[PDB]
Design an enzyme around this catalytic site. Structure first.
Site, PDB file in Angstrom:
ATOM      1  N   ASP A 181       0.820  -1.221   0.000  1.00  0.00           N
ATOM      2  CA  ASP A 181       0.000   0.000   0.000  1.00  0.00           C
ATOM      3  C   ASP A 181       0.853   1.271   0.000  1.00  0.00           C
ATOM      4  O   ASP A 181       0.486   2.265  -0.635  1.00  0.00           O
ATOM      5  CB  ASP A 181      -0.936   0.041   1.227  1.00  0.00           C
ATOM      6  CG  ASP A 181      -2.318  -0.597   0.985  1.00  0.00           C
ATOM      7  OD1 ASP A 181      -2.544  -1.271  -0.034  1.00  0.00           O
ATOM      8  OD2 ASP A 181      -3.209  -0.412   1.852  1.00  0.00           O
ATOM      9  N   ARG A 221       3.539   2.528 -10.932  1.00  0.00           N
ATOM     10  CA  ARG A 221       3.817   1.096 -11.117  1.00  0.00           C
ATOM     11  C   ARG A 221       3.830   0.697 -12.596  1.00  0.00           C
ATOM     12  O   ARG A 221       4.671  -0.108 -13.027  1.00  0.00           O
ATOM     13  CB  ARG A 221       2.779   0.247 -10.369  1.00  0.00           C
ATOM     14  CG  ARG A 221       2.772   0.472  -8.869  1.00  0.00           C
ATOM     15  CD  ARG A 221       1.619  -0.231  -8.167  1.00  0.00           C
ATOM     16  NE  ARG A 221       1.379   0.391  -6.861  1.00  0.00           N
ATOM     17  CZ  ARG A 221       0.407   0.033  -6.029  1.00  0.00           C
ATOM     18  NH1 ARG A 221      -0.426  -0.933  -6.375  1.00  0.00           N
ATOM     19  NH2 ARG A 221       0.262   0.657  -4.860  1.00  0.00           N
ATOM     20  N   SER A 222       2.873   1.207 -13.378  1.00  0.00           N
ATOM     21  CA  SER A 222       2.815   0.895 -14.808  1.00  0.00           C
ATOM     22  C   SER A 222       4.097   1.319 -15.515  1.00  0.00           C
ATOM     23  O   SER A 222       4.602   0.606 -16.400  1.00  0.00           O
ATOM     24  CB  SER A 222       1.604   1.594 -15.440  1.00  0.00           C
ATOM     25  OG  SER A 222       0.360   1.039 -15.019  1.00  0.00           O
ATOM     26  N   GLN A 262       6.642   7.886 -10.485  1.00  0.00           N
ATOM     27  CA  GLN A 262       6.010   8.950  -9.695  1.00  0.00           C
ATOM     28  C   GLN A 262       6.832   9.430  -8.499  1.00  0.00           C
ATOM     29  O   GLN A 262       6.524  10.501  -7.940  1.00  0.00           O
ATOM     30  CB  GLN A 262       4.663   8.463  -9.143  1.00  0.00           C
ATOM     31  CG  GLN A 262       3.542   8.431 -10.134  1.00  0.00           C
ATOM     32  CD  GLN A 262       2.234   7.879  -9.522  1.00  0.00           C
ATOM     33  OE1 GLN A 262       2.117   6.689  -9.177  1.00  0.00           O
ATOM     34  NE2 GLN A 262       1.265   8.750  -9.370  1.00  0.00           N
TER      35      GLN A 262
END
Ligand SMILES: COc1ccc(NC(=O)Nc2ccncc2)cc1
Ligand SMILES: COc1ccc(NC(=O)Nc2ccncc2)cc1
Ligand SMILES: COc1ccc(NC(=O)Nc2ccncc2)cc1
EC number: 3.1.3.48
Length: 282
Positions: A181, A221-222, A262
């Site tokens: 998370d 993540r992508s 990010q």
């Protein structure tokens, strides 16, 4: 510089935030005018994450062709990816329309439906064989065929039917279920194992349309997934693998979608994954 020793040099000097801010400063800025039209407000999950006009995926519709999705085309590596946001309640039909129209074989999902107590994307695939889904706005039917649950990820076989033509296709759903998370994984081993399973399926190969990859916004993540894949492929293709510059590859990918990677922790994790992955390949 090489990668593994550039890596230790940034760790010892504690300058990951400065490296990452340099990337943010040098990244491309292109218009995203279609994404910001008022009629598309409920098609975007986040107001600050939009596809560039020049690389956006167009739906084959005359009313509204907009989806928050981008084509990342890597010329030297000879790989393409579609990066998109997690579907919204009012875009699940658009999502499967895109999969169909772009001839994709695989969907890569890097988030859980609920994280940090909030919804990160819609439940857009069926959970039981006998309870299929019909998307009436785009005239598609989706059936769960089989499911294989492992410790770090789940693979599903799905059948997508175009109800207008009665054509059917098999879609593979690769779901990485254990990204924490907060932060990034401590070791890249399970993420690399997952990448290799996607590769082994054929979903990344030129005989199919581009793989569709998403998380919640489709940039963090992508971005880590496609950056690691492309860097490892270039290390196999080139005479001198130490010439592969992960910062240059990331800036190339950011010509096609804003914001990929990010946080500085995601940047460090991408280095770690490529470094460890290059040892296993040989
Ligand atoms: C994400 O929210 C959604 C809710 C509903 C639909 N469409 C839908 O349920 N069609 C339907 C098919 C069979 N019987 C009743 C209805 C799509 C998305
Ligand atoms: C993500 O939540 C979902 C909700 C509903 C469905 N589909 C469904 O209920 N289908 C159905 C077909 C025939 N008879 C009854 C039901 C799938 C997923
Ligand atoms: C956006 O997600 C969803 C879209 C549609 C459904 N429902 C659904 O397909 N119901 C159904 C019932 C009976 N026969 C066929 C279909 C559920 C979720």
């Amino acid at each position: 510089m090489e990668m593994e020793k550039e890596f230790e040099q940034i760790d010892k000097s504690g300058s990951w935030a400065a490296i990452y801010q340099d990337i943010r400063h040098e990244a491309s800025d292109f218009p995203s005018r279609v994404a910001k039209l008022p009629k598309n407000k409920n098609r975007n999950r986040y107001r600050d994450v939009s596809p560039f006009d020049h690389s956006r995926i167009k739906l084959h519709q005359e009313d509204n062709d907009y989806i928050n999705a981008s084509l990342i085309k890597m010329e030297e590596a000879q790989r393409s990816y579609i990066l998109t946001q997690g579907p919204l309640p009012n875009t699940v039909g658009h999502f499967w329309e895109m999969v169909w129209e772009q001839k994709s074989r695989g969907v890569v999902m890097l988030n859980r439906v609920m994280e940090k107590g909030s919804l990160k994307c819609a439940q857009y695939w069926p959970q039981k064989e006998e309870k299929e889904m019909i998307f009436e706005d785009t005239n598609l039917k989706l059936t769960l065929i089989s499911e294989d649950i492992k410790s770090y990820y789940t693979v599903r076989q799905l059948e997508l039917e175009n109800l207008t033509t009665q054509e059917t296709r098999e879609i593979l759903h690769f779901h990485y279920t254990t990204w924490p998370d907060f932060g990034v994984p401590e070791s890249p081993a399970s993420f690399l194992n997952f990448l290799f399973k996607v590769r082994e399926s054929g979903s990344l190969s030129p005989e199919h349309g581009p793989v569709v990859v998403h998380c919640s916004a489709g940039i963090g993540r992508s971005g880590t997934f496609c950056l690691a894949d492309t860097c490892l492929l270039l290390m196999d293709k080139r005479k001198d693998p130490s010439s592969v510059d992960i910062k240059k590859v990331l800036l190339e990918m950011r010509k096609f979608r804003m914001g990929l990677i990010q946080t500085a922790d995601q940047l460090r994790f991408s280095y770690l994954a490529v470094i460890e992955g290059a040892k296993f390949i040989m």
